[PDB]
Ligand binder design. Structure first.
Ligand code: ACP
Ligand code: ACP
Ligand code: MG
Ligand code: MG
Ligand code: MG
Ligand code: MG
Lengths: 291, 291
């Protein structure tokens, strides 16, 4: 793999640890990185390392490189997990990212159904992710795998968009159309992406709506009781998920707006941020309190 | 041998066939049984027949009878192979069981490393076997030989626990302790059964963990590269198998739970079923699909 000193990290200063993610297969691990922080030379930092699975194909590697390059290019944002470095020379490919001590969003929410979640907290999570995606979209890049499992939570409860394994740079085409193959998160995909294989910022918006649903159901699984294979027919029929109990009517309509059948009629992340900010501010300044 | 009309089958209506099982020695054969199905009188049914090996001892017979009686007593369950009848009078002892057209679990999995196995399918196999064992344990009986080689697969891919050659009824003692002898499946045995000769539902749980490992390695052999004789020392040292590549971290921890050094701390089949059901449902309703 090509060299890139800027992000290269000394393997010798990296020590792999335990696997991360209940539903993961062990290719993502915790790890100690000594000197990863330019400032602190001898200070060891707990990080997360992603590598190829035991028996990786040719494309597999190609997909991990892309994930890394995507992270390299988009730049820093408070609501996007940070790339810290990579070990690409004389050894297995390791992509080092900051460690989120509270796991993915789904595990995080399920554990607080232990400081329980309040309506305000749910709106806050949603607002933060809309900001992260607004930023990603402003870079003319699509994520393609927006879901609770791909959102991490820091020690201080900050929302971090992660796993850019399917992310694409659409700066020159304005829309990505795959002709290849591979497993895809169909229950999070917009109809046009599923049926026409067309992805855009608007298809990410659709996925954001599903994410909102996961957040308000506190880590629930989309289209409950519906085998993934049965979803295709339902979508062709215009099926849409019901409103989660913890969701206000206003937020449910926002959810349904994200699922508008016409891509261009769905709100933009810019609009979602503005509406979510209004809703967050009002809730923060008006919520009822237990005395 | 005592008579028992209920299960007795006319030899004249039974015609032995080819041997079954690559690793078997020929004492298990395919066979045609005319009238085995009370309903269909002239309809011939393909079944499996187990008999004593050429040069059977006194105990050998005693062990086949017990196997038959165990099957007679436990009752029917979707995930346990069915006893159809037996030829015990005026001739060699024949134990007739339903035929599983896709062989034992190991052969079945190895052949799909030909409709290949998906993660969901592996969880499904595991779930079914946990159900079978949960049922067996509810009858206060232990299997003592739970392994891929002792699991059969039907034409419609249903998992069937089989070979009750070592099974014991522990309704009156709550735990079986052998003082006799005989060859045992040490690589599938819990430390307390190996070292203290004590067997319980919890030792079957340990064996279930090894079975999970076989399933997720697609018919692999436990403790790879380790001669059976070398295992004893490793176990005394607390050795445990590494996670199979196809296994999620969550399922590996379930595996390790089955191998807890403290028998009572291992999960019960009831708990395994509940956790496996949750995992199976989630996977079925959320898996990524290739379009
Ligand atoms: N930086 C990090 N800190 C903490 N946990 C992390 C983490 N990165 C990943 N994880 C955990 O590992 C899980 C899987 O990570 P990731 O989403 O990057 O997988 P992946 O892209 O390798 C494969 P897939 O695309 O199939 O998920 C996450 O859902 C989360 O639980
Ligand atoms: N009902 C059945 N249908 C199809 N194949 C069967 C079968 N019963 C047994 N077999 C095949 O024969 C093999 C051996 O069967 P079984 O496990 O009953 O042996 P066994 O108890 O006689 C001796 P051991 O205890 O040494 O295995 C199985 O692993 C499987 O491949
Ligand atoms: Mg992921
Ligand atoms: Mg990926
Ligand atoms: Mg056997
Ligand atoms: Mg036997």
């Amino acid at each position: 793999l090509p060299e890139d000193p800027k992000w290269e990290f000394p393997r010798d200063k990296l020590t792999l640890g335990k696997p991360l993610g209940e539903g993961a297969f062990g290719q993502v691990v915790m790890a100690e990185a000594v000197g990863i922080d330019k400032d602190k030379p001898k200070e060891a930092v707990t990080v997360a390392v992603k590598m190829l699975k035991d028996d990786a194909t040719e494309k597999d590697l190609s997909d991990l490189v892309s994930e890394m390059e995507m992270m390299k290019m988009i730049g820093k944002h408070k609501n996007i997990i940070n790339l810290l470095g990579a070990c690409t020379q004389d050894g297995p490919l390791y992509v080092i990212v900051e460690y989120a001590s509270k796991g993915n969003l789904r595990e995080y929410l399920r554990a607080r159904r232990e400081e329980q979640m309040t309506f305000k907290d749910l709106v806050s999570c949603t607002y933060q992710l809309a900001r992260g995606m607004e930023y990603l979209a402003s870079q003319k890049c699509i994520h393609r795998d927006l879901a609770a499992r791909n959102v991490l939570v820091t020690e201080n409860n900050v929302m971090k968009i992660a796993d850019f394994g399917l992310a694409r740079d659409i700066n020159n085409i304005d829309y990505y159309k795959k002709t290849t193959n591979g497993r895809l998160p169909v229950k999070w995909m917009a109809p046009e992406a599923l049926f026409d294989r067309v992805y855009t910022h608007q298809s990410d918006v659709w996925s954001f709506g599903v994410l909102m649903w996961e957040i308000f159901t506190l880590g629930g699984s989309p289209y409950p009781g519906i085998p993934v294979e049965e979803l295709f027919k339902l979508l062709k029929e215009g099926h849409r998920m019901d409103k989660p109990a913890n969701c206000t009517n206003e937020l449910y309509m926002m959810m349904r707006d994200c699922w508008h059948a016409v891509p261009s009629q769905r709100p933009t992340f810019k609009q979602l941020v503005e509406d979510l900010d209004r809703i967050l501010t009002l809730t923060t300044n008006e919520e009822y309190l237990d005395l």
